[PDB]
Amino acid sequence: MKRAVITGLGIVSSIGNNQQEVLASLREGRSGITFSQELKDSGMRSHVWGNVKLDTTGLIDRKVVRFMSDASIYAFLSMEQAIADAGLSPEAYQNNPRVGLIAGSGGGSPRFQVFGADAMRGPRGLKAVGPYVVTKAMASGVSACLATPFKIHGVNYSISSACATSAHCIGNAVEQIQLGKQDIVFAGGGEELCWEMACEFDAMGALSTKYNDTPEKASRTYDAHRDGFVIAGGGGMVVVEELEHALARGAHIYAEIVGYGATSDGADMVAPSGEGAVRCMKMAMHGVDTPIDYLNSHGTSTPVGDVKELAAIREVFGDKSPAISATKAMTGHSLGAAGVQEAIYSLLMLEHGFIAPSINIEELDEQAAGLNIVTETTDRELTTVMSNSFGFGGTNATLVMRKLKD
Amino acid sequence: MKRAVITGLGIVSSIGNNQQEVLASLREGRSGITFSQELKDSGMRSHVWGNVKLDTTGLIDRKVVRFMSDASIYAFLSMEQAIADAGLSPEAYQNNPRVGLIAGSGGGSPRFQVFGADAMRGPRGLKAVGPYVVTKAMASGVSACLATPFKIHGVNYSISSACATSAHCIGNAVEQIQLGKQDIVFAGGGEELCWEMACEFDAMGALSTKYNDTPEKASRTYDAHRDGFVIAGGGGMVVVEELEHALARGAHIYAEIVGYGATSDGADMVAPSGEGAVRCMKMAMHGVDTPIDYLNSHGTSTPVGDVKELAAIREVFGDKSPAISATKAMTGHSLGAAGVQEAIYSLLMLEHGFIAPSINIEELDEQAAGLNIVTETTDRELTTVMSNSFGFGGTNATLVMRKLKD
Numbered sequence: 144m145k146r147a148v149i150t151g152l153g154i155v156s157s158i159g160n161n162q163q164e165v166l167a168s169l170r171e172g173r174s175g176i177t178f179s180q181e182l183k184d185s186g187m188r189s190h191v192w193g194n195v196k197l198d199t200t201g202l203i204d205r206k207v208v209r210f211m212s213d214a215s216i217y218a219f220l221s222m223e224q225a226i227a228d229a230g231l232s233p234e235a236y237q238n239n240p241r242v243g244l245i246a247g248s249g250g251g252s253p254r255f256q257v258f259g260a261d262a263m264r265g266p267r268g269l270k271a272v273g274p275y276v277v278t279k280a281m282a283s284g285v286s287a288c289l290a291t292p293f294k295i296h297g298v299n300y301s302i303s304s305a306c307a308t309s310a311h312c313i314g315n316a317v318e319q320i321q322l323g324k325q326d327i328v329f330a331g332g333g334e335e336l337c338w339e340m341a342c343e344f345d346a347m348g349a350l351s352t353k354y355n356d357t358p359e360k361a362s363r364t365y366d367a368h369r370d371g372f373v374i375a376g377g378g379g380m381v382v383v384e385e386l387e388h389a390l391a392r393g394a395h396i397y398a399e400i401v402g403y404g405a406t407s408d409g410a411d412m413v414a415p416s417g418e419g420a421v422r423c424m425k426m427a428m429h430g431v432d433t434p435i436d437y438l439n440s441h442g443t444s445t446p447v448g449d450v451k452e453l454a455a456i457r458e459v460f461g462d463k464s465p466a467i468s469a470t471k472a473m474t475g476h477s478l479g480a481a482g483v484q485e486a487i488y489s490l491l492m493l494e495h496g497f498i499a500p501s502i503n504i505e506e507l508d509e510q511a512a513g514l515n516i517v518t519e520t521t522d523r524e525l526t527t528v529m530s531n532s533f534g535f536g537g538t539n540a541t542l543v544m545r546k547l548k549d
Numbered sequence: 550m551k552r553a554v555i556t557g558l559g560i561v562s563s564i565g566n567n568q569q570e571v572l573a574s575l576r577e578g579r580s581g582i583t584f585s586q587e588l589k590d591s592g593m594r595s596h597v598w599g600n601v602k603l604d605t606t607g608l609i610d611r612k613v614v615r616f617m618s619d620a621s622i623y624a625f626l627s628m629e630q631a632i633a634d635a636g637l638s639p640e641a642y643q644n645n646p647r648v649g650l651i652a653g654s655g656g657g658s659p660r661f662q663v664f665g666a667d668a669m670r671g672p673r674g675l676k677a678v679g680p681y682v683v684t685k686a687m688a689s690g691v692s693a694c695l696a697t698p699f700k701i702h703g704v705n706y707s708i709s710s711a712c713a714t715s716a717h718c719i720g721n722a723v724e725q726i727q728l729g730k731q732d733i734v735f736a737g738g739g740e741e742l743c744w745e746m747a748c749e750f751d752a753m754g755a756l757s758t759k760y761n762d763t764p765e766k767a768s769r770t771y772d773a774h775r776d777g778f779v780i781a782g783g784g785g786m787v788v789v790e791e792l793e794h795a796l797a798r799g800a801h802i803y804a805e806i807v808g809y810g811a812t813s814d815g816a817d818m819v820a821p822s823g824e825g826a827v828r829c830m831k832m833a834m835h836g837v838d839t840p841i842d843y844l845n846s847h848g849t850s851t852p853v854g855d856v857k858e859l860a861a862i863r864e865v866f867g868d869k870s871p872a873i874s875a876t877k878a879m880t881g882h883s884l885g886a887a888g889v890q891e892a893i894y895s896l897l898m899l900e901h902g903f904i905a906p907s908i909n910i911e912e913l914d915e916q917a918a919g920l921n922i923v924t925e926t927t928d929r930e931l932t933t934v935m936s937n938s939f940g941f942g943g944t945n946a947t948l949v950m951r952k953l954k955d
């Protein structure tokens with residue numbers, strides 16, 4: 144009955160390029176959303192996005208970054224952070240069959256998939272395509288482009304489940320620890336930000352389009368006038384480690400993954416059923432007898448989704464409603480990367496004793512009446528936290544993390 | 550730790566639209582490669598592929614297929630076959646938290662990703678893109694598009710690992726049964742066939758280009774004159790079930806998954822290290838008290854690749870090499886769907902007592918000497934079979950299946 148703990152974390156987000164910058168943003172309720180000329184020039188209605196403010200040029204060995212797409216790059220940088228944060232020397236995690244990596248993305252790389260088709264149809268054909276498009280566009284790019292340069296010898300693959308992707312990745316890593324198959328598994332994911340993929344969401348009306356003049360107000364989970372989520376890009380990675388192994392080397396422990404839920408709606412393709420989320424959270428709560436002090440919701444700032452999840456939460460907790468805040472109101476929706484990025488925001492809140500505000504709620508949706516939705520940064524000692532991730536296809540994931548004594 | 554057996558299978562392949570057609574092709578050593586006008590027109594050098602010879606029009610409900618890409622369609626049809634072949638009905642596998650789905654693809658849908666970009670860049674913009682591109686293009690399309698219409702309530706996500714994709718899905722399904730989380734998990738995957746994706750492989754010189762005039766001979770694993778693999782499309786799906794649960798319902802049991810290996814090279818991005826394959830195979834043989842009677846190699850018909858695996862196999866078995874066959878010689882490389890399709894070819898061989906032929910070996914590579922490579926359909930009573938699946942990024946998967954024994 145092996146225990147799984149998080150001993151290191153790394154992040155590249157719209158609101159910060161390391162845990163310190165992210166910490167400050169969360170505490171200040173600072174938005175990472177900006178106006179995107181690229182999205183506007185593509186012909187989209189949504190002209191806002193949660194972009195990574197960082198020129199990654201030269202941050203990765205050329206011989207290595209040549210095979211990578213943005214999703215892989217973001218995850219790579221995140222992993223470097225997590226390795227250092229975990230205090231793992233090369234000899235400690237490299238060429239070690241007991242050390243694996245499970246990380247993916249929601250869309251792989253639409254940009255390079257399109258680059259290849261465009262190049263191929265041009266005057267140069269194959270010569271224009273080049274020999275690096277496959278590793279960049281394949282769905283497992285995120286895991287393949289990291290496992291190889293990091294000398295990973297254990298498990299190596301990507302779990303993909305739309306907006307639940309990185310959450311499932313972390314959960315699966317936990318399972319590897321529980322099966323005694325691995326001592327350490329770097330888990331997380333990444334996602335590129337481009338009109339190529341964005342227009343696809345805009346074309347189904349999933350993106351916000353009425354607040355382009357005021358980018359930082361576009362993402363407004365629970366607000367009565369929300370009109371879709373704000374697409375974002377970025378990456379995240381956490382070090383899931385077996386408890387004894389962690390203690391033995393004196394690793395710093397953020398928390399223990401005491402609960403992992405993964406269910407399926409078997410209902411609608413792009414809308415949640417809520418019934419599945421209820422089972423997902425309940426599964427994650429099995430054997431967890433401490434109260435959930437804070438719930439980092441999936442809340443993407445969409446009309447149907449936001450309240451559907453609030454309803455499931457009600458069903459699960461009843462008059463025991465935990466503090467709730469939707470960090471996407473600040474960060475935007477990083478899709479496949481949201482799972483790990485939000486587990487990190489939750490771990491930071493747990494580590495530093497505070498609840499990040501759910502911003503831009505000028506008028507609370509009436510269906511959210513009677514819930515403890517935190518709208519102002521609040522200091523508080525937290526012990527157990529829950530984070531939800533739901534994606535198209537009715538795929539659900541929930542992670543419950545708890546502080547260890549002393 | 551509970552046991553997992555396969556109680557049903559389904560397949561849409563270049564050599565068959567079902568297990569009967571697949572069985573007939575394998576024993577006959579029939580090829581599924583054809584000349585592709587599409588590949589030639591796109592400007593590629595490789596003009597051959599293993600296409601699915603099936604008019605899928607009207608095979609899937611209008612409201613269901615509208616969200617699907619070819620990879621999803623192939624997997625869906627495979628699942629329908631698996632369900633019927635398993636003897637399961639809606640009342641038993643639908644709306645059941647104890648039944649899940651783990652299936653994926655290698656590249657999601659480059660075709661619909663390119664369609665979205667092409668359409669968006671047109672004068673109609675968002676209107677031309679339509680509201681169904683995300684579910685077709687997202688990496689988790691294969692699992693999302695199946696779990697929803699089939700009403701799955703248990704796990705629901707895609708494992709993606711290039712050419713090892715569907716093999717990892719199966720092993721992960723096994724882990725769900727071993728963890729006691731699920732009683733049944735439909736596992737496998739699919740992959741579309743299009744110049745959009747194929748041209749990326751040609752651009753890196755991975756595809757055969759010298760036999761465009763003799764299609765059925767282009768794919769020739771282990772032949773000294775091999776020159777890259779032949780890309781293919783299709784799907785596969787097996788019903789992974791807990792032992793007691795299967796016996797209790799008088800289910801037909803093809804075999805038990807007695808071994809599952811998953812490792813990482815941590816070396817080259819597009820080339821195998823061999824060291825990883827060795828560990829992967831030994832991991833899947835740990836505890837197996839029976840010898841490997843047959844081995845369905847990864848063998849894609851590439852210069853370095855083919856020989857690297859053989860070297861790994863000699864390293865594992867020494868002088869006790871099992872009968873070896875590379876079915877890709879007649880089917881082609883279905884990338885993400887290869888793992889499950891080849892797991893199925895193996896189950897059929899184990900079920901019908903025979904070893905399919907490794908065709909097109911006009912001249913055996915010298916580095917292949919000393920091994921037992923079967924080049925003729927041979928009747929034999931197998932008990933324990935092994936299937937290997939390797940992918941870019943140094944991702945290795947190995948599955949060992951055996952006749953049932955309580």
Ligand SMILES: *C(=O)CCCCCCC
Pocket residue numbers: 248249250304305306307340478479533534535683686687688
């Ligand atoms: C989240 O579930 C919405 C769908 C994201 C899919 C990944 C991007 C193609």
Ligand SMILES: *C(=O)CCCCCCC
Pocket residue numbers: 277280281282655656657710711712713746884885939940941
């Ligand atoms: C097999 O490992 C070769 C790469 C397959 C990627 C499929 C998506 C482009």
Ligand SMILES: [N+]
Pocket residue numbers: 439440441485486530531532
């Ligand atoms: N979350």
Ligand SMILES: [N+]
Pocket residue numbers: 845846847891892936937938
């Ligand atoms: N195989």
